[PDB]
Design a protein around this ligand. Structure first.
Ligand SMILES: *C(=O)[C@H](C[C@@H]1CCNC1=O)NC(=O)[C@H](CCCC)NC(=O)/C=C/c1ccccc1
Ligand SMILES: *C(=O)[C@H](C[C@@H]1CCNC1=O)NC(=O)[C@H](CCCC)NC(=O)/C=C/c1ccccc1
Lengths: 304, 301
């Protein structure tokens, strides 16, 4: 089991450059619309608290330079939806994959295609933290890079990059321009809420350990969900939702270990330590691998 | 800012991946212009795999014994040859998506991106390193043979690896694109052990510089060391030797952080001798050796 990105080719064919003034960032070209962060229309003397509505009144179609490589795509319409700008262009992208826009929950993972000037430079796997930040890797000019999942041949876009926070973590929106968490696209220092450990993913990691025959931590206890949730929060663990219980179903069926029995096993690991031992080679409990991520990597048949 | 294990965008390689089938065996091939490259053991039955005479099995095959599929269309095989452990299938169609490319043989300690494929379908991408014992710590399942490793520079894809084998310890072995294995391994169905692995010293130091660039300095000290005395301790702890070339390649990271290379060596020596004492570096409880100096500069500058 390993942290793996989705192949990025379907997304690479969608990356473009958007320039307004001397500010260049990345945009996402799907059919005849280009999606990008709206702060591309900001000047260096106006980022502190931009009035985006009045800044955009000042802009016409001909103020936007959209480029696929060095090839210009003429902008024939523009609008703002929350914190994203939607630029209608004169050319439908022939590389447009089958796609959806989706808003992910904390704990869900996705691949990020980090881009600069519309040129992809790297791909890595991220998790949405419970405080709605991501521990990403972004340099200047990265805004507009997107995060995504791929299921069969459909790309589910879930993240567009906008901000770095003082602590070095990152914040952004879904593809309707709505920020994850309490952040705003302003040139200010914004504090992330206090983070927690992603319980459902820890449990997925324990199931993965069991699947591999590493199962010393399986105890003889069970628990109710409410009892577990109340203890978990005292160790800075997220509480479990009904949806979390249900996405652990397949792993519970595969191993024969009831979800609530594994919760009792995790509770013991929180109240005592690992003694000295490790799980899957590590002394730390991994929390950025989802139940889906574990199920996929069990065999070639499921991973394809 | 930030630090992640980062792979190269895989789109240029995705357009080259195909499915090759011989009899009951299916794996992946690499389609460049009008040739498909794939592991030669695709021609083996489960009988053959135990002790294949590969020249033996191949002369008994004809072109129509090979079924090559690219996405949804069959490519017709019109020629076949063998170069070391790779098969070269000539097909009657050029791959329009052929990128600019080169075949390279990489050195131990260097990194590359792996595009893991199953039945010709790319399914994940991750970053690996060629270990000093010429294994790779991959994640490969059944059907993954013929997946390739690569680096990209501008628009040119440098293919350095094609996947063939898993060892009993769970690490992996494979060839360059000329079909020559990395390390002492062979394409037969036997349990094979590697030589004793060592830690890639120059990469650990690059990673420590990354940790400093990202604001973490707890492991630094005011000691220094000579290069030879550092190498004495490194060899004691199963680390590869650090050469003057390594010291030079660390130059840019040293200049960026203001920490002389031999001072960082002194930090690493202390970490080797004292342990990490339950602390973390870039979220890791272990010293990480699969980031090269170039990888760190690329991601942190
Ligand atoms: C977009 O390219 C950029 C991404 C940053 C660059 C460095 N790493 C990243 O992730 N986004 C911004 O720079 C953003 C624009 C603000 C809209 C007008 N500004 C910030 O992210 C600054 C945050 C900050 C942190 C601490 C103190 C002040 C400001
Ligand atoms: C090709 O797809 C496959 C890749 C393996 C499958 C599981 N994970 C991988 O990386 N390659 C083989 O299966 C290879 C075929 C070569 C014989 C012609 N055989 C092995 O890798 C055998 C390993 C082994 C381990 C222990 C004891 C015997 C054999």
């Amino acid at each position: 089991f390993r942290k793996m990105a989705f192949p990025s080719g379907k997304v690479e064919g969608c990356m473009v450059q958007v320039t307004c003034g001397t500010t260049t960032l990345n945009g996402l070209w799907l059919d005849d619309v280009v999606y990008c962060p709206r702060h591309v229309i900001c000047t260096s003397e106006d980022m502190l608290n931009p009035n985006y509505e009045d800044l955009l009144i000042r802009k016409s179609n001909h103020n936007f330079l959209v480029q696929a490589g060095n090839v210009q795509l003429r902008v024939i319409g523009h609008s703002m939806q929350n914190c994203v700008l939607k630029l209608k262009v004169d050319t439908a992208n022939p590389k447009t994959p089958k796609y959806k826009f989706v808003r992910i929950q904390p704990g869900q993972t996705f691949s990020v295609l980090a881009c600069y000037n519309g040129s992809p430079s790297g791909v890595y796997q991220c998790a949405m933290r419970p405080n709605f930040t991501i521990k990403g890797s972004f340099l200047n000019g990265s805004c507009g890079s997107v995060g995504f999942n791929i299921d069969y041949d459909c790309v589910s876009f879930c993240y567009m990059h906008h901000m770095e926070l003082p602590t070095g973590v990152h914040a952004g929106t879904d593809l309707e321009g709505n920020f994850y968490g309490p952040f705003v696209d302003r040139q200010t220092a914004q504090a992330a809420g206090t983070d927690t450990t992603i319980t459902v993913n820890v449990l997925a990691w324990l199931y993965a350990a069991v699947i591999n025959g590493d199962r010393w931590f399986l105890n003889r206890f069970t628990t109710t969900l409410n009892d577990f949730n109340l203890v978990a929060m005292k160790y800075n663990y997220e509480p479990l939702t009904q949806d979390h219980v249900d996405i652990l179903g397949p792993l519970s069926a595969q191993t024969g270990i009831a979800v609530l029995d594994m919760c009792a096993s995790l509770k013991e690991l929180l109240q005592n330590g690992m003694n000295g031992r490790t799980i899957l080679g590590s002394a730390l409990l991994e929390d950025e691998f989802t139940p889906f991520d574990v199920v996929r990597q069990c065999s070639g048949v499921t991973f394809q």
